[PDB]
């Protein structure tokens, strides 16, 4: 339907918000996307540790989950993600397993279990020839 896409087809759009105004990010929808996975039974916390003040991200009127990033910026939630944040056991993400045992992981171990995407190229569609017959 759309324009010619050499890589993949995009039948559904991500519905990107406009960048004329500042943008709220509502995370109350996140929990069931987080509750989905097999080993996860629930989540215990959802907050930010005072790293929003550099661009004055204000939480909107009453709800704890939403935050509004100021005009130009876009979220980068964990920059240089596993080695900087997730593996180091500083706790940006604290896993609690069997009451309290609270196990952790390194950087390279989760990349093997990470889904690796595939670069796909879309060749043009043609009808190949049949056998030429001497009707002449």
């Amino acid at each position: 339907e759309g324009p010619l896409l050499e890589h993949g087809w995009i039948p559904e759009l991500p519905a990107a918000r406009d960048y004329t105004q500042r943008l709220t990010l509502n995370l109350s929808r996140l929990v069931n996307s987080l509750l989905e996975i097999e080993g996860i039974k629930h989540v215990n916390r959802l907050r930010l540790d005072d790293s929003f003040d550099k661009t004055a991200i204000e939480p909107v009127k009453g709800d704890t989950w939403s935050w509004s990033i100021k005009e130009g910026y876009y979220p980068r939630l964990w920059g240089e993600d596993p080695l900087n944040q997730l593996a180091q056991q500083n706790g940006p993400l604290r896993v609690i397993a069997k009451g309290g045992i609270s196990v952790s992981v390194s950087k390279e171990q989760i990349q093997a279990s990470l889904p690796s995407q595939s670069l796909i190229q879309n060749e043009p569609v043609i009808l190949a020839y049949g056998q030429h017959r001497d009707v002449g």
Partner: protein
Amino acid sequence: RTDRFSFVISVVVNSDLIKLPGVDPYKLEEWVKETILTEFPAHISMIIHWMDREAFLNFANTYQRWQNNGTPLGDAAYSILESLTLGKLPSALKG
């Protein structure tokens, strides 16, 4: 001053299970009494006291000599009575 001797089983545990990192011993203890709750009788009551490797091994010798004699009320039992809170009369064997 409470009645302690009626229906109270004491389970002495190693503290090397808590020695593993990331334990949060309170959060582990919510799981430990979670499973063995079904294992105990309803009337039967459990307080636990967990200690280091060396005080466990001093208990581990005194329990077997207690059980090999056939549970006597002698000096082997009074050492176990000292090992808990409840206090014992050890004055006959002072040294």
